[PDB]
Amino acid sequence: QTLQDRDLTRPVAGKRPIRLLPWLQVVKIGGRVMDRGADAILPLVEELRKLLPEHRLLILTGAGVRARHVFSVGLDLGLPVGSLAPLAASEAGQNGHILAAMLASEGVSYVEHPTVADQLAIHLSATRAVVGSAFPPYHHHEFPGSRIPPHRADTGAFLLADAFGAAGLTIVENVDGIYTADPNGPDRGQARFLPETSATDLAKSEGPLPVDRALLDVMATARHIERVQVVNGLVPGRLTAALRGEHVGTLIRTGVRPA
Amino acid sequence: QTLQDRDLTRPVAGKRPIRLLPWLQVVKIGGRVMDRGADAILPLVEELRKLLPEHRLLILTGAGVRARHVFSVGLDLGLPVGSLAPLAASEAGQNGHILAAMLASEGVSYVEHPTVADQLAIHLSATRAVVGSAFPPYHHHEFPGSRIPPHRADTGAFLLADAFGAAGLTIVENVDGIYTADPNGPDRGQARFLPETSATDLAKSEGPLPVDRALLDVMATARHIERVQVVNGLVPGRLTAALRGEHVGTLIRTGVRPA
Amino acid sequence: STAELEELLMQRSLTDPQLQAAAAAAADFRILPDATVIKIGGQSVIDRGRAAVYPLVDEIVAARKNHKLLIGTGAGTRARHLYSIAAGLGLPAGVLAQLGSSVADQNAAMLGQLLAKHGIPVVGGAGLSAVPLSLAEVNAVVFSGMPPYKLWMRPAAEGVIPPYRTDAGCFLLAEQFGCKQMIFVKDEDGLYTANPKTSKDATFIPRISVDEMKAKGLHDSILEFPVLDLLQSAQHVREVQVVNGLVPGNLTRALAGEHVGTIITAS
Amino acid sequence: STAELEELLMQRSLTDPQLQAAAAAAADFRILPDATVIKIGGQSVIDRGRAAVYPLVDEIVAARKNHKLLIGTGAGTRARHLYSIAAGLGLPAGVLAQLGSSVADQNAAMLGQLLAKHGIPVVGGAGLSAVPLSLAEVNAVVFSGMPPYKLWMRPAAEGVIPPYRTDAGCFLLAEQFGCKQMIFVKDEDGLYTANPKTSKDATFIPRISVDEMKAKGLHDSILEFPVLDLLQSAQHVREVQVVNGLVPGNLTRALAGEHVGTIITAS
């Protein structure tokens, strides 16, 4: 609609990569949600059960508190970031094993990262959902800089969702969304809820977020996913509403153009 | 042929602007060539006469020494660069009137800049060549910075040639081409001839050139003209050879991609 | 040394750094030092019709008792439509330049007819020959704001939209004539940290340098981005002021040298 | 304070700057401090066959008496062909990553079979479990140089070619293991001011910082451009050396710490 759009002689955006699983919905479950045990997991499992006939789901679990513990031990031992990364990824895997077992009677199993990378299409033809680790398998090849592995569960799940060209990625958190400060931290009195934000805005900000800061970097190079909603999985129905695109938490705009 | 060429997802260059006069050859005659009088002009006129049945020609004249004189007076009077620009353009016009008169019996006339901008297609359907001023009509709106008008004869002629999408622009000089130093200046002992150069290379260099430095800037934004040859019009046959693409002087690459 | 400059002018190429430096030492004459150049926005003012133009006509008539005004017009919506047609065809920037010029001419004619009964003419022609007499006698002239580059318009790095339009046209006339100031009349108070029309909470900026604008990503915001570079190269007009012509008195105060909108400085 | 770090790790997000700064103060353990990582170029060395590989095999066998070597392989021409097929289809960088990995695997297998009779194994698997024993006993291992990102490969800003390839794969292993140095073995003396293969008179550069490379436009010249950024973020490997493996003795001298090609420094 803009004058620049009409200019026949301007450079044209390259085509987007082909979508591998365009009909797929990707759902990332926070490790800290899993950490709450049955009180949080059982309602979430019942909600997931009712979503299975509606959506085809890749359910990816984060790591939570146990990865903080293994970081504590590993850092005390002096281990580098490429040693800490697979130790944390292991905890995301264990959360996946637990969640899949709760859904086994529905035909849901956890699959390891080689199966996620290569055979997801066959398994999602067999069954309505599969569970995997949200951490990527960066292992020894995690990037240096921080002593804390940067490419964690949010980041892995987004890389997968965008590589697949999936229909969406929803991040299921133990808070309502992104605030201007840690809503559980020492400045929680100043915390303001952000219904909507862009990843570029979040990236310039300093301070804690409920999502990996590398998530914002991989959003900048994203090709398909236009928005990711962070919703509170401790409130039943918000995951369901988010998967239908209802605005029930924080919408992060990736900067991918729509048209 | 490169891996990047094959990448379907990379941005694609915008289409080029439509060519107004794609069959046209543009020839810029240096004012300092005209300044040599009959000894230079008469052989050049005979060469041009023989080119008329071979090419359709827009012949654009530069200004030469008289513009240096009017600059000398105008600068002594303190006049700004937008006052000096039309005074110099006038001298390029007078050289055009002289050259056209020498070719009048061949059907060649000088035309003013409104006719060049708007009615060139009709006139080149009437006759094989027309003469114009190579200076652009920037007048009061010449760019500030230097006290010497930057957009001069080379620059005007290239802007026209590239706007027309013409088949070529050949610059006819009183030297063989571009040297590493002024071949008539105090360092002419160190002057090395450059058969070929890129405009980006010339732009980074410091020191005098036989072409406007603004020529290199407008080459950077050029859309059609890929190369401009600077040839010695005091050597009969070099203009003729250059119009057939033979390498007889300095080739300047504009940086426009070919494919 | 007039002789060393004269000698270099005869013997060197105009590209010779020695000649260029000698020419830079020449005296600097201001042709209309007491005049002020005003641009009346095409899109921001003239396209808004009577409710915008009539109050500014009154200010201009009142102002020409104390100030000498060269009043340039923008082009606005009709030029945008012409650019969209011509760019959709792939016509080059040199062809579009002419199209924008005719719209700026339309707006100068319309503004000029509202001012004719006050003696104020519309002036044109390559030489602007009617300016000195009009300015001496009725203290104002109206001119069309497009530069006269036509087919010799320098294109942008990308696309065929002419990058030198009516901001540049007006600024370059102020610079050429060595006018005492350059005032851009628009429909916002001045420069904000974002487009105030589409931005929830953009912050007003009352003063900024060219370099500061570029660093903030505001190069192509309130003025055509090449005007910032012309401003830094300018010999005579080293700053500009943008004001809100929809607020009565802003132009008048600005003409008197008041800081009422955004002042943009070369340095 | 192990207690303040432990407390932040339990109570804050890992994105909290306070936690991040506390983690940065942790002790720094080097896992294989006496080992050296070498990359054997795929395109520049292994693709050249016997005349290139056999002399380097001899140097490796001689060198493993005085040095502990992790020898990574590039991928080269066959990966370029795979990338051209897959990119022409529009497949994403995550899919191409796997393709390049299999070519690097081929080259590690070929190099490894030339070294098997000297006891030197090819090692693989996510954990590289065979490295500690092989390194202690025969002082060398061969590994495939691609990072294991697969479908989780980070794409470049434009296009689908994986930006982290076998330079990055080898460099990151050197960094993770805290090796004493990282040597890239190619087919030119080192870095030049332009591609020495296509440039008439490029100038050899024996030492340069990352920032100096970027300022000279050499970011994506001799190494994959992201490796320069990894280098500046690196905790353990703060410089690298590129040498000409076609010249006998260059690798040997480099292993001994001699300045024989181009040294690229993080700072």
Ligand SMILES: Nc1ncnc2c1ncn2[C@@H]1O[C@H](COP(=O)(O)OP(=O)(O)OP(=O)(O)O)[C@@H](O)[C@H]1O
């Ligand atoms: N700006 C912020 N907005 C919202 N929450 C924040 C912010 N800064 C910090 N937090 C904290 O982050 C907590 C969530 O922690 P975190 O993201 O590590 O858990 P998770 O995503 O479940 O774990 P994992 O990444 O292992 O899956 C929230 O409960 C909140 O206390």
Ligand SMILES: Nc1ncnc2c1ncn2[C@@H]1O[C@H](COP(=O)(O)OP(=O)(O)OP(=O)(O)O)[C@@H](O)[C@H]1O
């Ligand atoms: N690097 C260089 N290479 C070649 N000639 C140079 C160089 N530097 C300076 N010159 C001088 O420039 C002279 C040509 O001058 P100039 O380009 O002003 O004339 P012109 O092009 O005929 O004039 P106009 O621009 O008015 O048409 C050459 O004779 C030479 O002495």
Ligand SMILES: Nc1ncnc2c1ncn2[C@@H]1O[C@H](COP(=O)(O)OP(=O)(O)O)[C@@H](O)[C@H]1O
């Ligand atoms: N940051 C800003 N501060 C002040 N004015 C602005 C800013 N950005 C844009 N404008 C003004 O808004 C008007 C139109 O904006 P533009 O980006 O051209 O979009 P459009 O013309 O489609 O409305 C222009 O007059 C411009 O000067």
Ligand SMILES: Nc1ncnc2c1ncn2[C@@H]1O[C@H](COP(=O)(O)OP(=O)(O)O)[C@@H](O)[C@H]1O
């Ligand atoms: N400035 C430079 N100095 C040294 N080597 C270079 C330079 N530029 C490129 N090379 C080397 O040339 C080889 C191939 O160059 P590249 O640009 O990838 O083109 P191609 O692969 O098509 O030959 C690479 O190994 C690269 O490291």
Ligand SMILES: [Mg+2]
């Ligand atoms: Mg989280």
Ligand SMILES: [Mg+2]
């Ligand atoms: Mg010349």
